[PDB]
């Protein structure tokens, strides 16, 4: 991978692997989300970051994902090459946004797009806050100055408030626990694991006959290594829509909420 | 990747990704086992077994047969760091008509030093009935021409760890992780639990104090029975000793053994 000519975006090609595909021999959405994270991390490395700035490290601040929105038009097949371009944009005092564009490396067609909202958090107190002027000045030089949105519609085609699923849920997967492979290098549960846990409660008949087109996921709290999660889903709807909720079974504390849109194959 | 000069082995380079590394910023053994599967699959494609099957041959597809791991043995001397390039060479060889073996050699791409070695044994399973069967003469004849004729072993030395018989762990186990269940990401393209998931499940019962102070050097894992998508697994471990452990994976519903193995850990 490499920064683009103007140094304001980053591109990388990936060859879809045997273990990265599902039953239809195309990449799973969790493989797509892993590749989004990888190209994002390579972009941060290319501009000198490690995603904190010098001022952020001094004040004990970290970036944390508040929302993830992914839309897939075609999933790349096993052995296909997918090219991903990523960039970051300032949202003033609110936080930052990272967008992605997936393309078929052979035809150049846009096969998918994604957007994510990031907020600042004190690493000690775990409390969110607004971005100061000094933090903003350290990374604004790495962002396009004029707006560049992956989703012109509303910077995610579901900017809407995701409501909280009401008990009883229509479907569920109870007692989900992370294993050591679900942890990142900092010993925290990888953000993509939560996508897998949401999708565990979708009925098999839908998975076998439909393809996932859209996923919007809010991140509220983290699941720790010793926590246990319940995944709850209710149909809200050729197209099938679902409302999702992830909560800790120990006390019912919400960790994530989301929505999914599926299209009949 | 590409076939080697004589066309009897295959090589591929991999750049270690951010999410593929553990606490010390080096590749996990589950990432290594995933790369072993990937280079094996690319070797199958390079010799004419297309992406319409999971490295199965024409006769296998016709008879509804798939590949099944019987044993996996991996030895790591140095784990590649995040962003490092590891080169893996793989080859296949029949052991008369009793075994089908796939071996691997892992190397530092720049210096050429051997950083790891692995060996595996394979049998076939009917994808519908799930009944196992040894590799048949017709299936063998389809890939024999792509295998080295003279013996070629990742572990040629006498009394090497790869040939060790593994005993069955006695109850009570010293340590355990109970109630492990696969999720959809643990399934391969044939909707079976991926062989690497069992490696993760074995290692789940290792205590944190060992993980924090030691590095995994050797893992030998026998595969006796498959864990189905609706099964629940208990992972049991006992210290046999460097630290050595004896492992057992069994279904919690009836105690049926699915795997047994051993691990060797070196102090940091
Ligand atoms: N993890 C999943 C679960 C489903 F039910 C369907 C798709 C996926 C996926 O990761 O693509
Ligand atoms: N804010 C950023 C913008 C970029 F383009 C790349 C990295 C960061 C970061 O904060 O790590
Ligand atoms: N999955 C693991 C669990 C452990 F306890 C130690 C190492 C690994 C690994 O995958 O390398
Ligand atoms: N059995 C094999 C031997 C090779 F040399 C390469 C591929 C296979 C296979 O079964 O896919």
From Swiss-Prot, chain B:
Per UniProt, what is one GO molecular function of this protein? fatty acyl-[ACP] hydrolase activity
Indicate yes or no for the key word rRNA processing. no
Q: What GO cellular component is one of the record's annotations?
A: chloroplast
Q: Which residues does the entry assign to the active site, renumbered to this chain? A: 190, 192, 227
Q: Name one GO biological process term.
A: fatty acid biosynthetic process
Q: What EC number(s) has UniProt assigned to this enzyme? A: 3.1.2.14
Q: Which UniProt keywords apply?
A: Chloroplast, Fatty acid biosynthesis, Fatty acid metabolism, Hydrolase, Lipid biosynthesis, Lipid metabolism, Plastid, Transit peptide
Its subcellular locations are: Plastid, Chloroplast
Q: Which reaction does it catalyse?
A: (9Z)-octadecenoyl-[ACP] + H2O = (9Z)-octadecenoate + holo-[ACP] + H(+)
Q: Where are the transmembrane segments?
A: none
Domain of life according to the entry: Eukaryota
> What's its top-level EC category?
hydrolase
Q: Does the keyword Transport apply?
A: no
Q: What's the stated role of this polypeptide?
A: Plays an essential role in chain termination during de novo fatty acid synthesis. Possesses high thioesterase activity for oleoyl-ACP versus other acyl-ACPs. Substrate preference is 18:1 > 18:0 > 16:1.
Q: Which family does it belong to?
A: Belongs to the acyl-ACP thioesterase family.
Write down what this protein is called.
Answer: Oleoyl-acyl carrier protein thioesterase 1, chloroplastic
């Amino acid at each position: 991978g490499s920064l683009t000519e103007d140094g304001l975006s980053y591109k990388e090609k990936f060859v879809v692997r045997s273990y990265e595909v599902g039953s239809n021999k195309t990449a799973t959405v969790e493989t797509i989300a892993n590749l989004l994270q990888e190209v994002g991390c390579n972009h941060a490395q290319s501009v000198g970051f490690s995603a904190t700035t010098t001022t952020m490290r001094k004040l004990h601040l970290i970036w944390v994902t508040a929302r993830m929105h992914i839309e897939i038009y075609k999933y790349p097949a096993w052995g296909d090459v997918v090219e991903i371009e990523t960039w970051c944009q300032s949202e003033g005092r609110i936080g930052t946004r990272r967008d992605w564009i997936l393309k078929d490396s052979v035809t150049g067609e846009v096969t998918g797009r994604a957007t994510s909202k990031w907020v600042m958090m004190n690493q000690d107190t775990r409390r969110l806050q607004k971005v100061s002027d000094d933090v903003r000045d350290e990374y604004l030089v790495f962002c396009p100055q004029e707006p560049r949105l992956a989703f012109p519609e509303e910077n995610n085609r579901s900017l809407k408030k995701i409501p909280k699923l009401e008990d009883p849920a229509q479907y569920s997967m109870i007692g989900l626990k992370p294993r050591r492979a679900d942890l990142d290098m900092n010993q925290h549960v990888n953000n993509v694991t939560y996508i897998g846990w949401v999708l565990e409660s979708i009925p098999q008949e839908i998975v076998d006959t439909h393809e996932l087109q859209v996923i919007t996921l809010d991140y509220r709290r983290e699941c720790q290594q010793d926590d246990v999660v319940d995944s709850l889903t209710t149909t809200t709807s050729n197209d099938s829509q679902f409302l999702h909720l992830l909560r800790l079974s120990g006390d019912g504390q919400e960790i994530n909420r989301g929505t999914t849109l599926w299209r009949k194959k």
